[PDB]
């Protein structure tokens, strides 16, 4: 079964390795350490000297803790939104009791950076890869554009389809805190949620809700345990992965750039126009060609056994997404490209 | 090997098959009919009428949903407090924005009828088997109680380490909803909670927050969906083993119930006392003798291969806890009263 879908993906074979272990109690000295060792390898695949903390629950559940633990009720915070994830920051921030400013842009393109150079906000909300659209925001230039009219402001961003499939880092690019999930490029089930914070942004801590309250995880997660009991058999497959994967990190990520570049190769060869300016590694986004309805292409690729995703929002029912951001090889690639050119050459 | 601990335990076989299955994409109709199976298999665990709802994350997340959900902030609620847990909802209560009327017990007692039979109050919060104690509420008896002075008041309750345990109904035992997690009586990887929800109670809705707001997670697990990315590998866990456990609930329950009593009866007969007055078949609590210390029987059963609990709270470095609540049949059962006579030899 072809699983081409931008999250959840096609399973790393250490991951089952690990899921097919005997149950272990998260208080045990073996938890600690698995737990502790999982801390300290999402630290490195952060690029920051501050702390990760590892949330039992979805990617969105990080989102929302971020938000909450670094921002409190009443303050100015600026919010773009170019697809369904950053419409889900916005949204997130509002919840929140906080002031937001949103600022809208069609469905596949991205930020300007003077459009974020703007005066009187305590924080900046950006999704570097929007997975909905397939655009990738330049982070680096959008925060410094920000950081330069709001010297204390935080910036907080989203690096859910990011993290492990393009270049990440969190201080180095002027980004203070960042969440992730575990069903993206980390090639593991969904059920964790991470949360990055930069020695900056734990220095400006305001802790706050119940279950995601943030303190609380940090002084427990230092010793290797968790607030409430964690997901314990996810977090040994998160380990497990980035053993394996951090060691080549450049040679991994050259490779997923690669896959996605392969797919628009073969989109583009076919006439399809790409929907994004900026390509994130994590998937490529087409608009339908005209007169071919998304069910045909949706069915023509089902018949060959793989599975795909639409749009959503204003490009629902327009476009297609393909995704080999799951565990695939640079041959398993190919063969994906040969699915990929009989679609085309039957729907066209 | 020999996981003794009411939570996380003893995997079920099935869930270990399930967890082996390639990953599913939470969208596809596969997805669906297997989520919704779940929810209905949940619905007859529970005993209701009502829905259930499936959240990613921990049994405390859910228990926090169903506050929030439930009571809006300034409600008057009353919330007895006799253990670890029951404490737990204290807290939730409070950072929910409630006024909470706060009732002690001694560690390993539960409350009385008369003494939530109390008018002006818009809920009670109880925990059904309160596992740090291993005390067993009697839950219908202080439900009507508590609704005779309180005809519009409602009932939640915390049913962790009850639900598959032991005996358990919504609107039959008095109860408008309750929470429940996965790995106690489920017998499956930590990593899910849920919110059952009686007829009552869904017509009672407040919803409110952003990741746990339940009106829209019901808007989408009505049709099998989820708000968010759902851990479907989990899911897949839960349902396989409710598959097989409801069609023999009575047996499973009155094994369980005679696999604890088994441990209490040894440690009875070898001059342990024991912490509840009401037994809950979750858990053997008992006092340590005098003079032994907590870690002299966690180094006598972990040299046998086996894991233990401690005490929380008052009771910490005074008892110990012993479960077979994990997938342990008759026989192993026998074998673990057989291990237990023996570190009673040793440390006595």
Same mark, same amino acid.
């Given at each position: 079964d072809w699983l081409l879908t931008p999250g959840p993906v096609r399973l790393h074979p250490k991951a089952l390795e690990a899921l097919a272990r005997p149950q272990l109690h998260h208080r045990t000295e073996a938890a600690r350490e698995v737990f502790l060792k999982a801390r300290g390898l999402l630290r490195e695949a952060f690029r920051t000297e501050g702390e990760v903390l590892i949330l039992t629950g979805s990617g969105t559940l990080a989102m929302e803790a971020l938000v909450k633990n670094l921002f409190a009720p009443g303050e100015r915070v600026l919010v773009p939104v170019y697809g369904k994830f950053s419409e889900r920051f916005y949204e997130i921030a509002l919840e929140a009791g906080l002031v937001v400013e949103r600022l809208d842009y069609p469905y596949g393109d991205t930020p300007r950076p003077e459009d974020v150079?703007?005066?009187?906000?305590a924080g900046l909300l950006l999704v570097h890869s929007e997975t909905s659209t397939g655009a990738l925001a330049d982070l680096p230039a959008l925060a410094r554009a920000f950081k330069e009219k709001n010297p204390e402001g935080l910036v907080g961003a989203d690096m859910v389809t990011s993290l492990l499939v393009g270049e990440v880092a969190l201080e180095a690019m002027g980004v203070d805190a960042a969440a992730s999930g575990?069903?993206?490029? /980390?090639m593991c089930p969904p059920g964790l949620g991470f949360v990055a914070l930069s020695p900056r942004a734990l220095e400006r801590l305001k802790p706050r809700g119940y279950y995601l309250d943030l303190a609380r995880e940090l002084k427990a997660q230092k010793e290797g345990e968790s607030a409430w009991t964690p997901a314990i058999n996810l977090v040994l497959a998160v380990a497990a992965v980035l053993e394996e994967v951090l060691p080549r990190l450049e040679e991994h990520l050259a490779l997923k750039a690669w896959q996605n570049a392969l797919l628009y190769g073969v989109g583009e060869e076919g006439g399809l126009r790409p929907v994004p300016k900026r390509f994130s590694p994590a998937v490529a986004a087409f608009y339908l060609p005209?007169?071919?309805?998304?069910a045909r292409v949706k069915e023509a690729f089902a018949q060959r056994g793989a599975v795909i995703a639409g749009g959503q929002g204003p490009l629902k029912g327009k476009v297609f997404r393909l995704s /080999?951001?799951?565990?695939?090889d640079r041959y398993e690639a190919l063969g994906v490209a040969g699915m990929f050119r009989e679609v085309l050459e039957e729907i066209l």
């Open positions: 150079a703007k005066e009187g906000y575990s069903q993206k490029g /980390l005209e007169g071919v309805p998304y /080999l951001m799951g565990a695939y």
